[PDB]
Structure 1
Amino acid sequence: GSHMVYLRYFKGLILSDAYAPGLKWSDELKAYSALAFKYRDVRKYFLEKEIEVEENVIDSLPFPLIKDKIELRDYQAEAVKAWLKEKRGIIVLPTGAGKTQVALKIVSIMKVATLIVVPTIDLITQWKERINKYLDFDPGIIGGGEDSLKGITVITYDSAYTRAEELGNKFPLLIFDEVHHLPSEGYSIMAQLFASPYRLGLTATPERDDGKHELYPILVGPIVYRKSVEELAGKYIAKYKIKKLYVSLTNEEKKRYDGLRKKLKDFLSSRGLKLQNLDDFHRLVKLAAKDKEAREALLAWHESLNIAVNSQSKIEKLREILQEYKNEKIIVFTRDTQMAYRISKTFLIPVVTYKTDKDEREEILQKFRDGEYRVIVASTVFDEGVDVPDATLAIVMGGYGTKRQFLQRLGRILRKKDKEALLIEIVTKGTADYRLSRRRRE
């Protein structure tokens, strides 16, 4: 009768007949209301005052059948039990320490529908795989071109914010991988729009130069367990080994390589030879507009570096390393795409380009993960291909240079695994080594 107060969810907000700490009446909404995230504390309020409610807030998705294939370490098990006392807050570990396992173990404990929100696409791939291995369940995906909504779902921060009202009341547990992005002015609202009571945050860099990480208690909760890299410094792979091998040009290459290089040395010096300065490089470009021999000059310079970057020795060096490391799956990275076909045609191993059918790419990737293929080539130049599968070793051949952003992603994508990673990078000792090795860039 008149001893029942309404408490309902509506498009990212919480609605109620009666006041509660945090609510504010709205003539527009015709109820006391605030953003959805205040659901948890208002429910406990009404319950503490012994007030009977007709609660309609969480319309959960069904928590699926899983098998917990996770056996945590000591500090990992301390991490789960630290979160469990309040079921809210930020766990803090360095890369590789198993932030994912900590979360997916909590998933197995809570046994409630869970949404896991990640900043980038490379991270959707990692999370999808680890939920299959560690929980024996293929999670739904909202992002990366994929739209499936399941009892466990991986989603980007952007799709989360785009769909917040749609999904605000559907997952009781809410995981924020890479949580330091959350206090940003936009995702602040995204966090508040979910009604989820149980919310987990994961980060290696909890602190924020903006100082905006002070929003953690109102968005996810406080830090509940932290260990610095020095604080434990064990039982996990602490880095990825870099090896930068250099191989000399072919006998036939070196010949044409220098001849064209000497044709430039004579002409470029004939009229205004200034090098390594960008302004001088366009000087040659502007000259080559009208001069027939000046364009040929720039042609030979490209032809020289081409003979370097695509040196058939770099391929020959790959046969050595692939022969000499056959313990586990190897992934070859090449900026160039036509040069990737050479590696495929020579060694009879599958190739993946940016213009590869998603159907094909699925075969070549799922059989790789399964372990039908041992060694695979890829060319992520134009359509930036996220480092989809984890492995033990990866060879990068980009001679003219690797984006340290790209280079570091390969580290973190390898870093999270429990076994030490080895990263080879084959630079030719010609024009590439002479011009790239001048600046260290560490």
Structure 2
Amino acid sequence: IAEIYYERGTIVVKGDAHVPHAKFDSRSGTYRALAFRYRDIIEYFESNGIEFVDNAADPIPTPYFDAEISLRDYQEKALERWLVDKRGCIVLPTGSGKTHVAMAAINELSTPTLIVVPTLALAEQWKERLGIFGEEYVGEFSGRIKELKPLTVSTYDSAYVNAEKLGNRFMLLIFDEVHHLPAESYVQIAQMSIAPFRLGLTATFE
């Protein structure tokens, strides 16, 4: 029987020996893939009607969100385009409409979400902004506090260092790229996360 599980930011696959992007690891005697390949491996099992056990994903229990989705027309335009693959980047003119489309997305897919923002300061803002979902579901994971709520905002720093710990607890990954972040900060965090849904955010202005 097919089974997968997570560790050190990688997916271990037992059973199927022809799983995509999974390579054989002679040290362990197993196939292994970077955690972000999680989604592909899943769609591979399901698509081929293959039976499997998911010991990889360990989703934080998240409620059904149904709050005030107030966006601008162009803001709601993109959201719907990103909703097709739920794995892309969104460029927005505004900037407060960035922290807006994000909110919208979270609300649509009521799944555990990690929000990576540079600087604590910017995290503090996002927390109190996520409150329109329930202050009790909003957490912060940083050098200041390491809490894991269904909606946790983290700093590029804290997220990079605890990739092991955050990697399999979220299904939706959001990057608040303020002027964009390093291909060693940004890229590295993404790669070790199993999160099948990714949303990168940038504000042309400010």
Alpha-carbon distance in structure 2 between the residues aligned to 1:182 and 1:5? 37
Residue 6 (structure 2) pairs with residue 9 (structure 1): yes
Supply the AA of the counterpart residue of 1:135.
F
Shift of 1:37: 0.3
Alignment of 1:292-303 (within 5 A): none
Query: Which residue of structure 1 lines up, in the alignment, with residue 46 of structure 2?
Result: 47
Give the RMSD, CA atoms, in angstroms: 2.0
Superposition map of 1:176-325 within 5 A = 176-178=175-177, 181-204=180-203
d(CA) in 2 for partners of 1:33 and 1:89? 25
Alpha-carbon distance, 1:137 to partner: 2.9
Match of residue 30 from structure 1:
29
SS in 1 for 2:127: helix
Q: Classify the secondary structure of the residue corresponding to 2:125.
A: helix
Would the alpha carbon gap of residues 27 and 149 (structure 1) be closer, same or farther in structure 2, given more than 3 Å must change? same
User: Residue 135 of structure 2 corresponds to which residue in structure 1?
Assistant: 137
Could you tell me how far apart the structure 1 residues matched to 2:124 and 2:93 are? 20
**1:57-72 to 2 correspondence within 5 Å?**
57-64=56-63, 66-72=65-71
Which entry has the higher C-alpha Rg, 1 or 2?
A: 1
Q: How does 1:416-431 map to 2 (within 5 A)?
A: none
Q: Which residue of 2 aligns with 1:86?
A: 85
Mapped to 2, the partners of 1:95 and 1:144 lie a distance apart of 30
* Distance (Å, rounded) in 2 between the aligned partners of 1:96 and 1:102: 10
Question: Is the contact between residue 179 and residue 201 of structure 1 (CA under 8 Å) also seen in structure 2?
Answer: no
Q: CA deviation at 1:29?
A: 2.7
**Contact 1:92 1:203 (C-alpha < 8 Å) held by counterparts:** yes
Q: TM-score, normalised by structure 1?
A: 0.43
Q: CA deviation at 1:183?
A: 4.8
Alpha-carbon distance in structure 2 between the residues aligned to 1:97 and 1:143: 23
Q: What is the SS of the residue equivalent to 1:63?
A: coil
Offset at residue 80 of structure 1 (A): 1.6
Q: How many residues align?
A: 203
SS at match of 2:3: strand
For 1:201 and 1:29, the matched residues in 2 are separated by: 34
Distance in 2 (CA, whole Å) between partners of 1:198 and 1:56 is 18
Q: 1 CA distance for matches of 2:151 and 2:62?
A: 7
Give the corresponding residue for 1:390. none
Equivalent residue for 2:170?
A: 171
More helix by share: 1
Q: Write the deviation string for residues 66-117 of structure 1: whole angstroms up to 9, x where unpaired.
A: 5512322211211221111111101111233511111111111100000100
Considering fraction of residues, name the structure with more strand: 2
SS of residue in 2 equivalent to 1:147? coil
Aligned-pair identity (%): 49
Give yes or no for contact 1:66–1:136 (8 Å, CA) kept in 2: no
User: What residue ranges of structure 1 are gaps of 5+ in the alignment?
Assistant: 206-228, 230-411, 413-442
Is the Cα–Cα contact under 8 Å of residues 172 and 198 in structure 1 kept in the other structure? yes
Give the superposition deviation at 1:64: 3.6
Q: Is the 8 A contact 2:4 2:13 kept in 1?
A: yes
Partner residue in 2 for 1:159: 158
